[PDB]
Design a protein around this nucleic acid. Sequence first.
DNA 1: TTTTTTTTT
DNA 2: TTTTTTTTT
DNA 3: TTTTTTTTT
DNA 4: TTTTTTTTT
Lengths: 161, 161, 161, 161
Amino acid sequence: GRVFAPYSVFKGAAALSAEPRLPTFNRLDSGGVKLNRRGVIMLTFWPSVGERKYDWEKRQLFALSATEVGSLISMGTRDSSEFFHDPSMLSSNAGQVRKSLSIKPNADGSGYFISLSVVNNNLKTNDRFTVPVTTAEFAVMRTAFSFALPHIMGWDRFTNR
Amino acid sequence: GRVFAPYSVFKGAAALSAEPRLPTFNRLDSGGVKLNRRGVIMLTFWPSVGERKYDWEKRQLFALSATEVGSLISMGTRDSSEFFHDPSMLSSNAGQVRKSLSIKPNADGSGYFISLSVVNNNLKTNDRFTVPVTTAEFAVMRTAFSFALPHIMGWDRFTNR
Amino acid sequence: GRVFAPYSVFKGAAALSAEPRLPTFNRLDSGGVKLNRRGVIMLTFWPSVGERKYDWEKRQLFALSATEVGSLISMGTRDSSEFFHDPSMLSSNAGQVRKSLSIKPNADGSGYFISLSVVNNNLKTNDRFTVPVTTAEFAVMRTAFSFALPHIMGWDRFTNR
Amino acid sequence: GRVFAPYSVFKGAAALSAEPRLPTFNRLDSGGVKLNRRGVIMLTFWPSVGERKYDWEKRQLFALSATEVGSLISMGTRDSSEFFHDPSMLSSNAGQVRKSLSIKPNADGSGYFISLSVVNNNLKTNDRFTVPVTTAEFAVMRTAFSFALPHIMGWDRFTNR
DNA sequence: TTTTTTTTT
DNA sequence: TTTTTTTTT
DNA sequence: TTTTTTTTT
DNA sequence: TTTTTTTTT
């Protein structure tokens, strides 16, 4: 069965959620197993419609790859990164939706800003959710993501008993 | 069944103990599972009534959240933090008991001081337990807490087999 | 059964793959178990025959030992290392094939270069596969290898239940 | 059953071995479980009687506690520590055997020196085994010991399923 | 005994 | 296919 | 719902 | 064979 144990951070404008999506495996005819669809750390964003009350309907997703996770956890305090995703890459309708996730340190050094930009040329929409992440919150993420990385990679299958 | 494997540090005035409290889950009707009550790292303090002989009766608890754990493990040597808790928040009798946990580096750099303050306006009591933590002891905590963080978050449920 | 969950990095000239090989154990007559053949992190390299299309036939392997893994993960940004292996050491045909793996930081600091040299004096061949590894990619490796190290050592057998 | 998966380092004068000893638990009448005898990282030393040929008969043991492990893994490159143990503390024959383990960085910075001193006033013996540990070897230890620490503490018993 | 709360499947 | 070897239970 | 793809067993 | 001990459920 599925499991819902998100690490969620709520702030002024929007809320931020993070939970792993494990890899899918195919059992070969030879008996062994082969990783098929790679796992990710799924990031979800949604806005606040009212004093601490958020709109789950207007949520946007962003799937961190193994490498991108590696990038995030290796970030020094004075570091910043930006990831660009096309949800429908290699599909009939590519270049129509563009997603970009950005992590930038804030001036104070009291953590980072993490914002998701989603531009949809099909629906003519332009969404952006920014969420402030303290040092401690980003620390949970770094440690949690470090823990999950081997799993989303399927390396937890390698075990002596 | 339950499990009692505390990491305990004993010192002059008081003693310090730390062990995880796992999250509670509810099995949905849909089959999947959902994290309900979040896990914590439970901290217990108690005084010394006599030459190395402590009073377990006068113990006070403090429950570290995921974020607070993230804060503790991310602490540089020259860092200090303070957490404030109301045990009965959102309850009939709030603001009546106040707890504060403080981690401050000591002058020497030979670790930290960790003290729990508990002010009870109902019972008119004022308790404070301070415990010195060497670099090595705080190292156990940092590593142990890092290990436990994924578990108290319920991320150990995400596993390939 | 076996498991195939490689961490693969594809680049211009060649491709790089990494996955653990667990240790083999023998069950003693006394009942206990004893680690026999030590585990490794297996590295595979292969060339590119055409615009992003690689030759799996011309692959070369390199097996990182526990210690060598320890070396790799302890590398600062400004560090470089080189490992020399004779595949047929202590065998009839030693000194006939020589392998060397090198990790050097690139000028920019944007990661490392990792190249495998294989000199075969029996077949009169001289192969070399170089692959550029970004900071994020090497971060995956560092974290993945850290996770796997206890397992290839067989220390995952030590567990309370 | 027991498990033998030592991390061993062999050098000129002596050899060094390290493997965890898990904690013992007692099942309470209440149903739960309680950690009884604490786990350790067991260190074994033995001399070399001949060109790369060691004397397993003249081995000496040293049991690292949780805290001492915490100390070892927190060591910077320029750090050194010394631990003193009386094997028969709180026993009929205390003060008769004294053990001391020392970790000192070597001049070059190419790792550390680790030596075990055992003075026996009952048998009138004075033993000392020194073993050089490269940066990579000590890296294996740091990572392996970090992995094992939660287990020797019995914190691996805390798990969601 | 424990600072709660915010959104789904 | 893989750099081995050293000491026990 | 999710940026894909490249090579085996 | 191993530095112990301190307080509960």
